[PDB]
Swiss-Prot record:
Disruption phenotype annotation: Decreased sensitivity to the cytotoxic effects of 6-azauracil.
Domain notes: The 2 chromodomains are involved in the binding to the histone H3 methyllysine at position 4 (H3K4me3). The CHD1 helical C-terminal domain (CHCT) binds DNA and nucleosomes.
Shown chain mapped onto the complete sequence: 712 to 760 of 1468
Subcellular location(s) per record: Nucleus
Protein task: ATP-dependent chromatin-remodeling factor which functions as substrate recognition component of the transcription regulatory histone acetylation (HAT) complexes SAGA and SLIK. It recognizes H3K4me. SAGA is involved in RNA polymerase II-dependent transcriptional regulation of approximately 10% of yeast genes. At the promoters, SAGA is required for recruitment of the basal transcription machinery.
Protein known as: Chromo domain-containing protein 1
Family per similarity comment: Belongs to the SNF2/RAD54 helicase family.
Organism: Saccharomyces cerevisiae (strain ATCC 204508 / S288c) (Baker's yeast)
Amino acid sequence: HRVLIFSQMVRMLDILGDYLSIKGINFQRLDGTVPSAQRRISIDHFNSP
DNA sequence: GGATGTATATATCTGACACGTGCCTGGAGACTAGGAAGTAATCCCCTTGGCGGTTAAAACGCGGGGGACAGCGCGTACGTGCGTTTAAGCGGTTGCTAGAGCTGTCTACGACCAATTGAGCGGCCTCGGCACCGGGATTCTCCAGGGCGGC
């Protein structure tokens, strides 16, 4: 399985990103701080076979 | 042997403590009215954490020259000291007037209260001016016919 995780706060997204960084899980991220080019890059990277 | 240095005692000066007195202002006691605390309702602004898109401001780098700063010379203007003058400072005259303080009288002026009403705040209707739409007058580009030339 692959999982999306939705949050109302981007600071809680930072907390989960650090949790997966010390945990060691390949994660990708999207919020309002990420510009549209890196958003397109991340969505295409997650959807690649 | 005479006079000088020094110690203890006595009279006088002076700031401080307590006693006395007035008086007037603060405190005690009582009453009352209203200022403010509390309550409920309504509505609008502010808080925190986000997103999206524009864009002009902020940031960064680099070249260069204008300006800040240091040094040096110089000459003038200010400091310093002394002798002389002068006016400030103190004490003094001599009267009159201004002003603080106190007491007294009175009157016009402002506080206070009730009734009234007319000037301030909000909305509604209308006009002045600006703007949207329809119709008439004026000017520009174009398609076709007539005449001339060539094989």
